[PDB]
């Protein structure tokens, strides 16, 4: 996260670190959404152009962490993956459209002060909250500067941008399944998501019911924190019907 700052303890209890087993390294962010379900970005698991193709067998999720490296004793929980569910319409050739995946844990994680699931939005929530200028909050252990590696979870607050501006910003083709967010070049304040931050949630707090909703997923962006450049985020609601269908079918 560029231009961020350290998370407060328990500030982002839904944050999930996606960790490959060997060589032991951080891959991506992710978010706890139930006690058995973690939501990430697809490209974290399957990006052929980078020869990236991971199996449930290959990875761990670490839940409730604050420090990037250290093993939090009596804080962090470590889950095993039972089933990756990459989106059937996920396009990795064109423009990372539908960059989303659902992971089911072998065993439910027990919630604590540090571990807690975020909410997913509905028509009303998405409708009243996804307007341009409205700010959300991006979290991760990714790169501080474009080339990073903080030793502690990072937070930045970024405003939703309107689709016209998103378009003119990149040569890459946009779909409706994406929103861009970030500061315009005259706006004096800056910040962005970066490499290592994918899968991580874009949350907003509701003024109605006082809850945190995951509206997005760090997906992509050319560079980190360039002027006139904006980070792009998977549109969590527009895929919610799939998220629900999946969980309804392979849960209960």
């Amino acid at each position: 996260i560029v231009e961020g700052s350290d998370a407060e303890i328990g500030m982002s209890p839904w944050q999930v670190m996606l960790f490959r087993k060997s060589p032991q390294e951080l891959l991506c962010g992710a978010s706890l959404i139930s006690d058995r379900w973690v939501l990430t970005a697809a490209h974290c698991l399957l990006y052929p152009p980078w020869d990236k193709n991971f199996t449930e067998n290959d990875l761990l999720v670490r839940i409730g962490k604050h420090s990037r490296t250290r093993y939090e004793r009596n804080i962090e929980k470590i889950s095993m993956l039972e089933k990756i569910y990459i989106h059937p319409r996920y396009n990795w050739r064109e423009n990372l459209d539908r960059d989303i995946a659902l992971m089911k844990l072998k065993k439910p994680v027990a919630f604590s002060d540090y571990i807690h699931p975020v909410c997913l939005p509905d028509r009303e929530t998405a409708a009243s909250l996804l307007q341009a200028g409205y700010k959300g909050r991006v979290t991760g252990w990714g790169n501080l500067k474009e080339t990073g590696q903080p030793s502690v979870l990072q937070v930045v607050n970024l405003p939703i941008v309107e689709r016209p501006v998103c378009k003119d910003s990149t040569r890459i083709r946009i779909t409706d399944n994406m929103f861009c967010a970030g500061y315009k070049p005259d706006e004096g304040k800056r910040g962005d998501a970066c490499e290592g931050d994918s899968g991580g949630p874009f949350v907003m707090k509701s003024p109605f019911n006082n809850r945190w909703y995951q509206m997005g997923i760090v997906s992509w962006g050319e560079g980190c924190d360039r002027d006139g450049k904006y980070g792009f985020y998977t549109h969590v609601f527009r895929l919610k019907k799939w998220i629900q269908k999946v969980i309804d079918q392979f849960g209960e």
Binding site: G10, M11, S112, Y134, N157, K205, S206, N210
Partner: peptide, 26 residues
């Protein structure tokens, strides 16, 4: 059910240092 509320913030009637900034942009 329980989702969206933090054991160390919402549930203890405390806010984080920056969440106001989010609420002010509505």
């Amino acid at each position: 059910a329980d989702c969206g509320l933090r054991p160390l913030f919402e549930k203890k009637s405390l806010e984080d240092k920056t969440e106001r900034e989010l609420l002010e942009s509505y």
